[PDB]
Design a protein around this ligand. Structure first.
Ligand SMILES: *[C@@H]1O[C@H](CO)[C@@H](O[C@@H]2O[C@H](CO)[C@@H](O)[C@H](O)[C@H]2NC(C)=O)[C@H](O)[C@H]1NC(C)=O
Lengths: 49, 49
């Protein structure tokens, strides 16, 4: 967390700082998106947050 | 003549409190930039075939 990284979630590769989100995704949602259609936020596949 | 001028400046207080309608010319300019920035941002979602 809080460091810039080459992340990859389930094949969703990218560059970013990662942080804990107050955003509450539904169980059917694994990813979120920007108005620009970039992957904004992610639900982690091993720890459900 | 001073009472006319002082009255007339008094009416500018009321006009500029009550509405945006006169400043709409500056509103149009900031709004056009916001619209164009948001368009160039939304075009990132274009799949282009
Ligand atoms: C010119 O017009 C002004 C108003 O713009 C007149 O001034 C008013 O006069 C009456 C009394 O006659 C007062 O009750 C008002 O309060 C005055 N208004 C102001 C802003 O002072 C003025 O009398 C007119 N002069 C002439 C020569 O016709």
């Amino acid at each position: 967390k809080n460091k810039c990284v080459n992340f990859n979630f389930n094949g969703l590769t990218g560059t970013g700082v990662l942080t804990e989100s107050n955003k509450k995704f539904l169980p059917f949602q694994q990813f979120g998106r920007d108005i620009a259609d970039t992957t904004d936020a992610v639900r982690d596949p091993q720890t459900l947050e | 003549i001073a009472n006319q001028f002082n009255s007339a400046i008094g009416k500018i207080q009321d006009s500029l409190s009550s509405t945006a309608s006169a400043l709409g010319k500056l509103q149009d300019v900031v709004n056009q930039n916001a619209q164009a920035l948001n368009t160039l941002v939304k075009q990132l979602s274009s799949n282009f075939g």
